[PDB]
Design a protein around this ligand. Sequence first.
Ligand SMILES: *[C@@H]1O[C@H](CO)[C@@H](O)[C@H](O)[C@H]1NC(C)=O
Lengths: 213, 49, 49
Amino acid sequence: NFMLTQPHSVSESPGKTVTISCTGSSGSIASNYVQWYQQRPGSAPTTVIYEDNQRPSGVPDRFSGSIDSSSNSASLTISGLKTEDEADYYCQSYDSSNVVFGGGTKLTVLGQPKAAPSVTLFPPSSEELQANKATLVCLISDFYPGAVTVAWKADSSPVKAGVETTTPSKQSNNKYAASSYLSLTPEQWKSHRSYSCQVTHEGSTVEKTVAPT
Amino acid sequence: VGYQPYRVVVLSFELLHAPATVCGPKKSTNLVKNKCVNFNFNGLTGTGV
Amino acid sequence: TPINLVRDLPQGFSALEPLVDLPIGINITRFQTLLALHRSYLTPGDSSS
Ligand SMILES: *[C@@H]1O[C@H](CO)[C@@H](O)[C@H](O)[C@H]1NC(C)=O
């Protein structure tokens, strides 16, 4: 029942000093070796310090660790932060026969330009109609901020059933892009005269319309 | 959670040679009459009907 | 107290009852009253003469 306690969120401006703690629950922190792994997002973890004072060959000198056995806490001190330090630090105590990893500590330090919501629409294809389905796809792209509200319309009545939308995502254009899908039956697509997608972004509204042709 | 804006206020009390100005009230039970009882109406410990 | 007189206040008697009691507890040594003036169409409207 030995668990390591680590703060969830730690943020500090670059160039300053910060202390990362790791508190043991039952066993004393000086009983067993405490190791810190620096893991980049979408990458394998890498050892950043071991033996509570020993640095691996390759990491810089700033990664310093200390042990406070009176408070049952392991302290990792970082001095002079910069960009690539934005990784996850897990304090590891294998103890005996079981690695107890820490919760983890991330980093948070801080140009997206404003843009117009280009909107395109497509009607359901004939192949989809032959496969007893119909889906209207609304696409919002090349815009900023990434906070848009979609509202499907059947001629004049809003449609909310079967509406699926995507959260805005980052692209190479430094702008945002999103998507919206309206699943429909083949008879519902041809029941209304026209279907339109309305996109609201920074007050301005861009609306496209399609018709069964 | 450790860096969010928190609205913190402190309520302090003062003790001087002045009567109470802002203080809590007191509850109210029943009332009796025409019997020899003791009453404390803020100025006297009077016993009587 | 209603009256119909402009000068030499009458010899009648009238007590004074309280309206509010303020427990402030501060010094006081000087006082001054406030008056209100009117700005009609006859006066130019400037507070000089
Ligand atoms: C109040 O006034 C008296 C004299 O007018 C002065 O001696 C005393 O210090 C004053 N106290 C306070 C609290 O201002």
